[PDB]
Amino acid sequence: VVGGTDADEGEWPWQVSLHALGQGHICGASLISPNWLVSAAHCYIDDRGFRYSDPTQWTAFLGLHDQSQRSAPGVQERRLKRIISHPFFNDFTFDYDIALLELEKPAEYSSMVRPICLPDASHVFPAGKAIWVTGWGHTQYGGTGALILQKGEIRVINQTTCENLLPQQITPRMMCVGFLSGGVDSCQGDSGGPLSSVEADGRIFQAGVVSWGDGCAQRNKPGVYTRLPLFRDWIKENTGV
Numbered sequence: 001v002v003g004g005t006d007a008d009e010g011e012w013p014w015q016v017s018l019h020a021l022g023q024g025h026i027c028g029a030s031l032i033s034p035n036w037l038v039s040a041a042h043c044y045i046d047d048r049g050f051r052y053s054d055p056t057q058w059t060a061f062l063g064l065h066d067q068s069q070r071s072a073p074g075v076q077e078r079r080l081k082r083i084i085s086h087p088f089f090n091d092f093t094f095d096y097d098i099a100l101l102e103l104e105k106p107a108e109y110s111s112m113v114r115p116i117c118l119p120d121a122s123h124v125f126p127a128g129k130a131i132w133v134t135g136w137g138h139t140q141y142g143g144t145g146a147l148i149l150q151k152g153e154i155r156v157i158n159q160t161t162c163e164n165l166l167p168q169q170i171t172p173r174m175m176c177v178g179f180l181s182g183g184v185d186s187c188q189g190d191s192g193g194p195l196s197s198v199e200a201d202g203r204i205f206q207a208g209v210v211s212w213g214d215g216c217a218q219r220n221k222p223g224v225y226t227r228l229p230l231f232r233d234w235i236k237e238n239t240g241v
Helices: 159-165 229-239
Strands: 015-020 024-031 036-039 058-062 076-085 099-103 130-135 150-156 174-178 194-198 204-212 223-227
Touching: 024 194, 024 204, 036 204, 058 099, 099 229, 130 204, 159 174, 174 204, 223 229
Parallel strands: none
Antiparallel strands: 015 024, 015 058, 024 036, 036 099, 058 076, 076 099, 130 150, 130 194, 150 174, 174 223, 194 204, 204 223
């Protein structure tokens, strides 16, 4: 996250860190039930030197605050049993960039580990609404990852504006969130994490999944996120949640 601040310990108890064995933190995810996480499909694509699509190559850390203190009290370590990437995911356009990760053993809810709420299919996160992005990704484009979880406040951008800022690249599964002036944005390593939106009684709902961007925090280049309401039924069908 560029332009953000250190989160308070336990402030985003649904935020998860996914590590590929021997590689460190690669992407984020969100806890949605005792057995399931939501993340981005693009994080689990094989490359010539590493099988990121193999669930056995991963470790999820729940209740994590500082990447250098992964054994701190309250942090829970879990392996993955399965990765369900959306069947329509396109690795060139990044359309349908969403995946479901099944924990090998259930998470234990605590003050530091708690699921985020999922929005109903009909819910609209309105243009202009302030929402939060969190993660351990780079704090500057081409920069370095954050040891301490970062948070940043960004706003939903009108879809027509989004489509015009990134021509021939924005599908209806995507949403631009950030600022036309730049400044605050997600970045490498934040992928897969949740957008957190404070709703009517203060409860937090997941508005989207960190997906991609042209650089980070640049003017007229807000980050692109996968929308969540559109996938409510798909999540229910595949997880029971």
